[PDB]
């Protein structure tokens, strides 16, 4: 068990899938390098920047309480109890940043609403979370999957992919995502050959059995995926084992992640993926690349990350001059949303501070007893330009506390020796794509 | 807001859907007469009987803390906080009886496992709840829907109903129930014409739109339903509005309930339903029929129940001689499971009492600090003959804390002037049915 507790005048809770789900029985597995560690560090980086900002919360130091979810909603609920213990060692929590997986964000939201704690997700896209009658303290820097499903149905309609197979991860992301896709597909006269579900529970079929079901309909060469990152790897690995070749059309769960395709680049060649439209935070790259196990002792998972990333041991022995750089690192696509989520919470607290304490820069008596209801409704639904790092760059929430439906379309290609994801299109309300730039496995 | 707090040496928590979900926005609606009030009263009756029993917990008085779930998992979580407050006015809770809907039992279980509180459901049939790695403190007097789905697929296979439509309630009961059915159907060469989902969330279609989808496949005259009681009424009402005629094959969600069919008996004629194999508790009938608003003041919802049931007001004025009797009352099918769940908890506590306090009948020092882990694992998985009321009548749990897969098959018929559900078959591991006794709408 591990955590990050940095004391401050106001403390922000944080939830990241630092570790994957453990195999068989174990709660926690391997370190999730890109969607775990990087995202965690993007929150720490944003907190550091805000604490250096003389225009945003001067006189109010932001502390943190960051916990691992181990990519499980059950594990995340146990961890989330620590954020509410001080309302029932435990510190008071102003707001919560996370989680990543929609199921954990849902579980956490069910608990947090009972303590009027505002919650901002930087990656949870389930349309379920747009229900304000149920998730009254929830907001997100990301859009609902109502739009991603539409974007995917429009891609198939554009290429006349009228007879397709679907595979979905069981849970809050995959099931509602594919249900939304199936409605949009039907409105566009797109038929579904087979609809498979994957996941761990006793009711699911094997990944090899799912691949066998996909090959049983050779007519459907395009497979639409609304799946989790961990489930996506298992499916590809299964496709690779039986040398199954399909044109994968995948949601943000896969996105532009190299971890899903490393080792099985052949079986995933020509894949079309979506990811939320984002731009890299250049200052984060500088910050992340400067981290090493000798200077980073506030992150208790950093040593495990380092040993996994570089295939090492401390006390092959880890070389002292090992460094995170452009040769072994790429900024995770949703980092922009993590920084924006921390900044959204900061801007809402600054505005409440300037309203309730006009006489000081400090946490006045009128603000010591924080009103989560008012913080959420009267402040958090605000407006700001993307955090002192950016060249619609405004951070805001709609009536439902959601971000804007903007996606980038990617194609898994070879470029020039190196396998990568090339941006080949965009979706904002309509689909735009550069068809000539796409490589489909073998030509077409 | 209302509750039942009866102080005792050991207190049992209780969760019942006393009220339906409220329309539009309101949390609570009409009183749920049969699956709400009757079930609540069956727990109170069992507690009264145990407190009169000189062989089961003599010297240990059983108190209660019974709350309304308003047929919502969100509402049930808020109410369940009251059971754990005394571990964080609030009383200590030995075990929890409920809930009814699988989604509420799931939400409650997520919370209770964190406080090592044993939970026994008398009606939650979701196969999800058999996962002991996730629901480690959960047991139930009822079986998982792995069996009901099989029982339903075997009924269709028996009648050569090879091209059917399905309708499922969104949520933990309907979705996994129909997913299990779809696997069993496929193993029996049964094809699914259309698969509709119903429910309240923003993603679901109208009940009228679902009926329109069913009529669009006239070939599929048999419609399989894995749906909640409240959703079942809405679907029938919709079928009745457009005079849609189908052969309904429904899960226990519909069961042998008259409330689902009252007013729309014509559209549901010839329906085949399943319900868990049970026998009425004769002593409960005596107890329930003796209740009136002048003697029942421990139940704060009884006055609302009385006014709804009899179309009354207190201070048409309610006639003082109004009585619950065989002319206006029938024992709810799952009452046996409520009494057994209370008795299961009592027998586990008695056995722990006799093990830790052999010297007394009282709650000794070695038992004042209750160990929920040991209570669940070492005692609750026990053996007893159905509570001093019965003519396999044993109350026990399998390795997964589940009851036995035994179902009764019913047919909605006219009998002789009166519309009712006639038992026409049974499923225990194989299907047995009396085909000649079945009335299908118009002859066949
Ligand atoms: N959008 C995903 C999570 C995104 C991510 O981890 O990159 C979900 O709804 O679970
Ligand atoms: N078996 C149903 C509830 C049973 C009932 O209320 O009669 C469920 O899984 O939700």
How near does any CA of chain A get to the CA of B176, in Å? 8
Count of beta carbons in the 10 Å neighbourhood of residue B298: 12
Resolution of the deposited coordinates, in angstroms?
A: 3.2
Structure determined by: X-ray
Q: Is residue A67 a contact partner of residue A15, using CB atoms and an 8 Å limit? A: yes
Cα–Cα distance for residue pair A345/A342, rounded to 1 Å: 5
Q: What is the Cα–Cα distance from B15 to B80, expressed in whole angstroms?
A: 8
Task: Please give the Cα distance from A79 to A166 (Å, whole number).
Answer: 34
User: Both A154 and A233 in a single domain?
Assistant: yes
Extended strands (E) in B32-157: 62-68, 95-97, 119-121, 138-140
Write out B74-92 in H/E/C secondary structure.
HHHHHHHHHHHHHHCCCCC
- B301 alpha carbon – ligand 2 mean position (Å): 21
| CB-count exposure of residue A226 (10 Å: 0-12, 13-18, 19+) | buried
Nearest residue to B260 via CA among B239, B229, B291:
B229
Residue bearing tokens 């608003």: B293
Give B340's contacts (C-beta < 8 A, 6+ positions apart).
B122, B141, B386, B387, B395
Distance, in Å, from the CA atom of B34 to the CA atom of B291, rounded to the nearest integer, reads 14
Atom of ligand 1 nearest to the CA of A228: 10
In whole angstroms, what is the distance from residue B47 CA to residue B343 CA? 8
Return the closest-CA partner of residue A134 out of B264, B286, B21. B21
Only one residue has tokens 């707001």, namely: A95
Question: Is A21 within 8 Å of chain B by CB?
Answer: no
CB of B334 sitting under 6 A from ligand 2: yes
Q: Check: CB of residue B104 under 8 Å from CB of residue B15.
A: yes
Q: From CA B106, how far away is CA B77, in angstroms rounded?
A: 10
How many other C-beta atoms can be found within 10 angstroms of the C-beta atom of residue A274?
Answer: 25
Q: How many CA atoms lie within 13 A of A56 on its CB side?
A: 21
Please tell me what DSSP assigns to residue B318. P
B359 plus B424 within the same structural domain: no
* Binding-site annotation, residues of B: 102, 123-125, 173, 252, 334
When CB atoms are compared, the residue of B88, B128, B202 closest to A201 is B128
Q: In angstroms, rounded to a whole number, what is the distance separating the alpha carbons of residues A303 and A324?
A: 13
| Known binding residues of B for L-glutamate | 102, 123-125, 173, 252, 334
For B257, the token pair is: 């309930």
Contacts of residue B331, Cβ cutoff 8 Å, sequence gap at least 6:
B38, B280, B281, B284, B285, B288
- Residue B245 CA to ligand 1 center (angstroms) comes to 43
Give the three-class secondary structure for B407.
strand
The counts of H helices and E strands in chain A are 12, 18
Closest CA–CA distance from residue B71 to any residue of chain A (Å): 14
* Upper half-sphere CA count for residue A85 (Cβ side, 13 Å): 13
Minimal-distance CA residue of chain B relative to A177: B203
Same domain, A42 and A27: yes
Q: Max CA-CA distance within chain B?
A: 72
Chain A residues whose CB is inside 8 A of the B134 CB are 74
Task: Tell me whether A134 touches chain B (CB under 8 Å).
Answer: yes
Per the structure, how many domains does chain A have?
A: 2
Helix (H) or strand (E) holding A157: helix A145-158
Mark whether A307 and A444 lie in a shared domain: no
- Same domain for A119 and A218? no
Roughly how many angstroms between the first and final C-alpha of chain A, as a whole number? 50
Q: Are residues A238 and A381 in the same domain?
A: no
Q: Could you give the CA distance from residue A55 to residue A49 in angstroms, rounded to a whole number?
A: 11
Same domain? A6 vs A130: yes
- Please tell me whether residues B272 and B284 are part of one structural domain: no
Check if the beta carbon of residue A278 is closer than 8 Å to that of residue A339: no
Q: At what angle do helices B229-241 and B207-215 cross, to 10 degrees?
A: 60
d(CA A153, CA A11): 42
What are B424's two structure tokens?
């026409």
Q: Quick check: helix, strand or coil at residue B6?
A: strand
Q: Domain holding A205: CATH number?
A: 3.40.50.2300
Atom of ligand 1 nearest to the CA of A251: 1
Question: B-chain residues within 8 Å CB-CB of A194?
Answer: none
Residues 269-308 of A with CB under 8 A from B: none
CA separation, residue A273 to residues A207, A346, A370, A423, A430 (Å): 20, 33, 42, 9, 17
Which of A107, A180, A202 is facing B203, going by the closest CB pair?
A: A180
Dihedral sign (CA A271, A276, A278, A281): negative
Query: What gap in Å lies between CA A78 and CA A96, rounded to an integer?
Result: 15
Can you read off the two tokens belonging to residue A329? Answer: 């690192």
Three-state secondary structure call for residue B146 = helix
| Together in a domain, B6 and B135 | yes
Rounded distance between C-alpha atoms, residue A396 and residue A388, angstroms: 16
Taking the C-alpha atoms of residue A329 and residue A326, their distance in angstroms, rounded to an integer, is 5
Distance from CA of B331 to the nearest CA of A (A): 34
3-state secondary structure of A114: helix
The residues pairing with A422 across neighbouring beta strands, listed in sequence order, are A411
Cβ neighbours for A92, distance < 8 A, ≥ 6 positions apart: A11, A86, A370
Same-domain pairing of A220 and A247 = yes
Give the number of C-alpha atoms closer than 13 A to the C-alpha of residue A317, restricted to the C-beta side. 2
Tell the burial category of A317 from Cβ atoms under 10 Å away from its Cβ (0-12, 13-18, 19+). Answer: exposed
Cα distances (angstroms) measured from residue A399 to each of A104, A140, B204: 23, 12, 21
Of B14, B5, B1, B11, which is closest to residue B104 (Cα–Cα)? B14
A25 is in an annotated binding site: no
Residue A384's contacts (CB-CB under 8 Å, 6 or more residues apart) are: A343, A344, A347, A394, A395, A396
Nearest-angstrom CA–CA distance, B121 and A98:
32
Which 3 state secondary structure label does DSSP give B396?
Answer: strand
- Strand-pair partners of A164: A192
- Give yes or no for a cis peptide into A400 (omega within 30° of 0): no
List of chain A residues whose C-beta atoms are within 8 Å of the C-beta of residue B129: none
CB contacts, 8 Å: B77 with chain A: 110, 114
Helix (H, G, I), strand (E, B) or coil at B433: strand
B81 contacts on A by Cβ (under 8 Å): 114
Clarify whether residues A262 and A313 are in a common domain: no
Q: Name the 3-class secondary structure at A183.
A: helix
Burial class, A312, CB count within 10 angstroms (exposed 0-12 / middle 13-18 / buried 19+): middle
Residue of B378, B370, B398 whose CA lies nearest to B142: B398
Q: Where are the alpha helices (DSSP H) in B85-144?
A: 102-112
**Residues B63, B135 share a domain:** yes
| A266, HSE (Cβ side, Cα atoms, 13 Å) | 9
Q: At what angle do helices A282-289 and A38-50 cross, to 10 degrees?
A: 110
Measured distance CA(B421)–CA(A39) in Å, rounded: 58
Asked if B203 is an interface residue toward chain A (Cβ–Cβ < 8 A), one would say yes
A125 is in an annotated binding site: yes
Structure tokens belonging to residue A315? 């006390």
Distances (CA, A) of A274 to A221, A239, A335, A408, B239: 19, 20, 16, 6, 40
Check if the beta carbon of residue A276 is closer than 8 Å to that of residue A327.
no
3-state SS assignment for residue A95: strand
Please give the helix or strand (H or E) that residue A19 lies within, else none.
strand A19-21
Helix (H, G, I), strand (E, B) or coil at A426: strand
| Residue A252 in marked binding region | yes
Instruction: Give residue B77 CA to ligand 2 midpoint distance, Å.
Output: 18
Distance from CA of A87 to the nearest CA of B (A): 10
A168 membership: H or E segment, kind and range: strand A163-169
Domain containing residue B178: 144-277+405-444
């Amino acid at each position: 068990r591990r955590e990050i507790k940095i004391e401050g005048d106001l403390v922000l809770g944080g939830l990241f899938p630092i570790n994957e789900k453990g195999t068989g029985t174990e709660e926690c597995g391997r370190i999730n390098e890109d969607r775990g560690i990087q995202r965690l560090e993007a929150m720490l980086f944003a907190i550091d920047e805000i604490n250096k900002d003389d225009y945003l919360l001067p006189g109010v130091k932001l502390g943190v309480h960051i916990l691992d979810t181990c990519s499980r909603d059950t594990y995340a609920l146990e961890q989330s109890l620590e954020f509410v213990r001080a309302s029932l060692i435990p510190l008071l929590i102003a707001g919560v940043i996370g989680g990543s997986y929609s199921s954990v964000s849902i579980q956490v939201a069910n608990l947090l609403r009972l303590f009027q704690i505002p919650q901002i997700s930087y990656a949870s896209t389930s349309a379920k979370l747009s229900d304000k009658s149920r998730y009254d303290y929830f907001a997100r820097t990301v859009p609902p999957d109502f739009y991603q499903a539409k974007a995917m149905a429009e891609i198939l309609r554009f290429f006349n992919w009228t007879y397709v197979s679907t595979v979905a991860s069981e849970g809050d992301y995959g099931e509602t995502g594919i249900e939304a896709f199936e409605q949009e597909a039907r409105l566009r006269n797109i038929s579904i050959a087979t609809a498979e579900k994957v996941g761990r529970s006793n009711i699911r079929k094997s990944y090899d059995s799912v691949i066998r079901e996909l090959l049983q309909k050779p007519n459907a060469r395009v497979v639409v995926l609304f799946m989790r990152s961990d489930d996506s790897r298992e499916l590809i690995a299964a496709a690779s084992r039986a040398n199954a070749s399909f044109t994968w059309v995948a949601s943000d769960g896969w996105g532009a992640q190299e971890s899903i395709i490393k080792g099985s680049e052949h079986v995933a060649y020509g894949a079309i993926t979506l990811e939320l439209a984002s731009q890299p935070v250049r200052q984060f790259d500088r910050y992340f690349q400067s981290l090493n196990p000798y200077n980073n002792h506030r992150n208790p998972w950093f040593r495990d990350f380092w040993e996994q990333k570089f295939q090492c041991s401390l006390q092959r022995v880890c070389d002292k001059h090992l460094a995170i750089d452009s040769s072994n690192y790429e900024q995770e696509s949703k980092i922009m949303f993590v920084v924006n989520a921390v900044y959204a919470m900061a801007h809402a607290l600054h505005k409440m501070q300037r309203t309730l304490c006009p006489n000081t820069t400090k946490l006045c008596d009128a603000m010591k007893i924080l009103d989560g209801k008012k913080l959420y409704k009267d402040y958090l639904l605000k407006i700001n330009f993307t955090a002192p790092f950016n060249p619609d760059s405004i951070v805001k929430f709609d009536t439902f506390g959601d971000g804007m439906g903007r996606y980038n379309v990617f194609n898994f290609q070879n470029v020039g020796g190196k396998y990568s994801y090339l941006k080949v299109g965009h979706w904002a309300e309509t689909l735009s794509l550069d068809v000539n730039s796409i490589h489909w496995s073998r030509n077409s």
